Amino acid sequence: PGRLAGKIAVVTGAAGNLGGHIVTHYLAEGATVVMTGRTPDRTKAAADALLKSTGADPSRLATVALDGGDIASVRAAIAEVVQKFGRIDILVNNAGSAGPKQPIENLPLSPEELAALQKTGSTDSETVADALRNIFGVAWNVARVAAPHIPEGGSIINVSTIFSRTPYYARAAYVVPKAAMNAWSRELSLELGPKGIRVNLVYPGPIESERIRSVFAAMDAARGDEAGTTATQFFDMMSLERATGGNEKAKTFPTPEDIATTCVFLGSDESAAYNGHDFEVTHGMSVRKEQRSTYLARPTMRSMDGTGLAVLIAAGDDWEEALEIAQVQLACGAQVVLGLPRAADVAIAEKRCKALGLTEGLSIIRFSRKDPAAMEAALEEYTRGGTPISGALFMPALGAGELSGAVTEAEDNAVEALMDAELAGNMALARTMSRYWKRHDNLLQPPRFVFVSHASDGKGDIYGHILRAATEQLIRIWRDESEIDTAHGRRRQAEWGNQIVRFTNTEAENIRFTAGHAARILLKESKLGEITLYVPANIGEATGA
């Protein structure tokens, strides 16, 4: 009768390789399928080819024009589906893009920089911000606009990629948005579950194709590694050998068909007990959900730790917080550049710092991550003093609780602020310090960055989690690009760093503790293996204090 018999399915990016196989399996198992694309001729041609290959009645397959990041297009597209079919039973969030293929040091942020890249005959067609709208934006918008029209026992399937959890050289523009979705998918599962709507996350592995081994070879060449380094890295992660396509049992890639059959399982009522569950179609690739640890010790720190070192702090709206962290760095003997986003806050803070007598080693400047050009100039200007920045601490852009609301009800500005102020900003900070330590490649200690989360919003920390996941993958990509670049001699000093999550602790001592542990990563000579480090829920009990 069909495993999806009498179900209305919406598949985003339905014209892609996975899209086509999903629509195929879905029409086979009896669903009515609505295909989504940005380009109505591309998505119509795909539907016509599917109609011929499938034999399906044209009544069972329609198409709709959708652009993630244009909520108006998403609203018109879902309304058309609803007017046409009256409900959505299965949403497959499959739509994505490759984004720009540049190491962090060379990401295009402005449209003029993207144009600049298209003169090098690069195939890049997207800003970091376009990539975010096309990978993370689509899933967020289409899910929120569709959720009201999905009944009890409905199924949302969010298509990520295993690469969101692994090193992938020159692909931060693609993987960090996917890692952002990963965490959003979980938050959406918590909100829609009580309504009886299941949210599940598919992580396909590298997908078998005639192209993939060439594409991995071209990646090998672009970073000066021998043909097969990339493919071999992913095979060594896999625990399962398989006979695919008539070939013998080997290290090989899961197929598009593997992804489609998982999407049938999850769309069918056979998966009704699954919520916020991960489906890793990877031949057993060994990765962790989170490379992480809690701090089991009080930060211990000497006064002569920081001599000759300069820490940059990229503060957000709450400068008062950033300055308390600045103080602990000054106590460890280092110089501090406190970078405040509004010039307003420079005046207020520079004065309120004379009040506290902090002028010995502290300079306070305008530093806005929305203006990477100005950011660059400001570091050139500071370094003219003759002490190079050896360490960077990044704080979130927006004030505590500025980001707020359920992910589905929360306004047009919610996803736009998260994408623009925090996710895009994290990339601009990363590119800026990546370019700086390229030029100043002879530091007293190899350079170190620390990203810091907000304190708890006491509301489940929805945005704390999305950013924590995204930051973590941005660090793993940044560590790995810098390690390969160094090993090949394109850099003298390899860049290393961590994330500190504050929002697991709501104690008064949280910031001085967080600040103390930032000083240890920035000023001591150390390599902390784990990317994300959590403040324990009770610092007294957790440590000796």
Add this chain to the structure above:
Amino acid sequence: PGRLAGKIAVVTGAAGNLGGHIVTHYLAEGATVVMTGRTPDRTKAAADALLKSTGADPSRLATVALDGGDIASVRAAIAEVVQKFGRIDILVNNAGSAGPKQPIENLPLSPEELAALQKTGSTDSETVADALRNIFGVAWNVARVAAPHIPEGGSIINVSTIFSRTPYYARAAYVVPKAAMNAWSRELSLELGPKGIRVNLVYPGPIESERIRSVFAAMDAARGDEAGTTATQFFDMMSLERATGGNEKAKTFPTPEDIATTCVFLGSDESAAYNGHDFEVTHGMSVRKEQRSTYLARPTMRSMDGTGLAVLIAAGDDWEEALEIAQVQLACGAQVVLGLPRAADVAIAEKRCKALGLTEGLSIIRFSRKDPAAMEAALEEYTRGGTPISGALFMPALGAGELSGAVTEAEDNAVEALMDAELAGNMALARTMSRYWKRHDNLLQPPRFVFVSHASDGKGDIYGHILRAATEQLIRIWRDESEIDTAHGRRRQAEWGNQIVRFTNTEAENIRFTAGHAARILLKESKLGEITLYVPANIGEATGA
């Protein structure tokens, strides 16, 4: 055509509730099924019931006698399957028992203790060892005997329980073996995946039944919370609401049907891409994979930290390792009882102590985890001396490396020593110290226990990992039972503790590092939330020194 058309399936414990549904669903999908049970009269009646409920041709169903505690029985059973059907396409390791329903403090270890319980009116039919072989040994033995007869493209489905990762009052004897089982399923994932045999792990939630909702009113009474409290723990962990049994949408239990359609999916070629993967059929229960962290700090200790405190070290075979760890405690001003299994080892070790000069504050005694009564008497004997035991450190039972072999190639005596020496031994130590801290409930400091892993075996730490995952769940149960006993005024002092995993580091300082972090847990006023603490690969990098 059947989604299982052409497959031979073996389902262990096919007689029970999940068993029945799995066989039903498999027969529906074209599988040939061999049912397993210890009791042929039982299995045969169950087969006859299923032949009637399912129009299945009798040629497509057979039964077979299999006691997982007896490797000969297993050999004969799979010998018989191979003779009738030539091969095993799908092995569903569903066999397992409830185990003695007893808080750690009252675990039955000897047949006499079990006999005692039965005059008492409890439905307890198993010893801790019995539960180990019934829940863990069967899965280990069935898979190893079956593995050679499974073709590439084959599927092993291990059925565990979410309760293997949650607190579960008075179910240590059930959930600890299931924990060990989870870690074993991952090792078998790594051993057979290269042969192209996939190994995957089903984690059912609390399953819909009339009895299981009263088993929850039972467990509710054992603890002395209002009825519905246990139901509400697990319901609150769930994120998905569902309409089952024609009731209206609510926090309810997953169905046996949900387990069986999962088994169909995993048994079928549709799941060919998955290996070492978890399937949590729990309505999105928020449990983590592991409550864990890596030590980012050298252990700092002080000379007078431990005065008035007394620590038991339960050594294994290598008493020399144990005494090095004892030295660190003595050097922190704590008294030490060093407990040695072999009474020969007592005088031998007494010599080295004068030569090593460790005379004051140290007592040494015969302490065997194989002899609980003597353990309890010796602890009482020592305590006459006037200092009660505030802290307990448990060393592994067997010599380093004594446990080896791929889980599918390890000698007959591999699973037997793992179960009797290490797993059952740890339950005995846990029960022994619960009883001691019931009697001595007014210590200067809350009681603390440390489980120490072996050093690396330099062969992947197969047994290190299994014994670690089981020890993690034992500690979760111990902590939680003591937290509930203390909250309800049955005990003044809450028992806490942790596991230290050594095998993650091969540096020379490894033993000194662990001994000191053991001292911090046992002698400082502290409560480290995370259960398992890893020694970092590079001590000198993870900590500035």
